[PDB]
Design a protein around this nucleic acid. Sequence first.
DNA 1: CGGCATACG
DNA 2: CGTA
DNA 3: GCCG
Length: 327
Amino acid sequence: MPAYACQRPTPLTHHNTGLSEALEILAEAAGFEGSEGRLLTFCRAASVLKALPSPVTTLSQLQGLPHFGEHSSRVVQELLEHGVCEEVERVRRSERYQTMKLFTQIFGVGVKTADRWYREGLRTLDDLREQPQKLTQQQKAGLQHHQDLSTPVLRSDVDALQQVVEEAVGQALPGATVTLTGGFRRGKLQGHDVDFLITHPKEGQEAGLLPRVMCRLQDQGLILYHQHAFERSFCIFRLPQPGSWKAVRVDLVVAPVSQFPFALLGATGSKLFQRELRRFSRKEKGLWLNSHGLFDPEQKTFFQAASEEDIFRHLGLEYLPPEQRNA
DNA sequence: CGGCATACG
DNA sequence: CGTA
DNA sequence: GCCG
Ligand SMILES: O=c1ccn([C@@H]2O[C@H](COP(=O)(O)NP(=O)(O)OP(=O)(O)O)[C@@H](O)[C@H]2O)c(=O)[nH]1
Ligand SMILES: [Mg+2]
Ligand SMILES: [Mg+2]
Ligand code: NA
């Protein structure tokens, strides 16, 4: 088992679901406390289990696995022996964990905002609604639409949205393309949002595109919220339903075609996969990776990629299709 | 011990 | 600060 | 919290 998640296939469904979910609770709780390092270790340990070919049934099967030390091993030991880990259950029922989860789930609220509200004594969504002067416009939208945004987006919803995005994109710039990214590209059947990447085959034609797309979607009555030159937009869309509609989060990204493989890789995820890939690039290969390119700081040159396959090859990694990037 | 991804709105 |  |  290699130490980095980008060195091994991780499928969407696997053989250690309950163990990985427990470790991910501890990761989330670490994040709520500001401990990024412990969040990373628990996430990485969880992801190792996702990559295993069969269920862990005995503690000895963790020997030698990366990211399993005394703490993560004890959690697994307790789950194997008793079906429950007391530390995990204590986190689950704690007021701090439940409220931070509730608040950080709001669009426009991160850990630092949630923590401040917690310390001020706020505990419920209605607590926040009763003091709406202290909310950003983004938080107001996240709170108004919170119930709909709490409903999973279905793969059935994605086809309808991609068609309306393509229509607006086609009027804004004929020949521009729309690619589904994020979790759905990795094979997820549901999601918290829909993520799209937009480009044009002629380098430079994509400049100025996203304002033109957003204005057109807004004219069609499809935009319930957006932030407004820009190249990423975090929107709330009106999606039809039988007899009505529901609010759905949609992310749009524009990239020049020269950067498209890097933007596609960076937007396809998973989040942990991308962090691990960027860490691998810099620490093992001495190259700096982001969603625009791959830089050699010794030659001061950028690597021209025509595909995601190119990027894995330039990093000396076996290619992983999106469905195996579910770290 | 230092390090823990990286960029845009 | 928020977002991906 | 764990790795190197
Ligand atoms: O912190 C982050 C968040 C997101 N991303 C990148 O942006 C992509 C979309 O980010 P996302 O927040 O839409 N997550 P996704 O995997 O689509 O699952 P879901 O919760 O169902 O929407 C992710 O898959 C990563 O590639 C990061 O690189 N870092
Ligand atoms: Mg998504
Ligand atoms: Mg998204
Ligand atoms: Na949030």
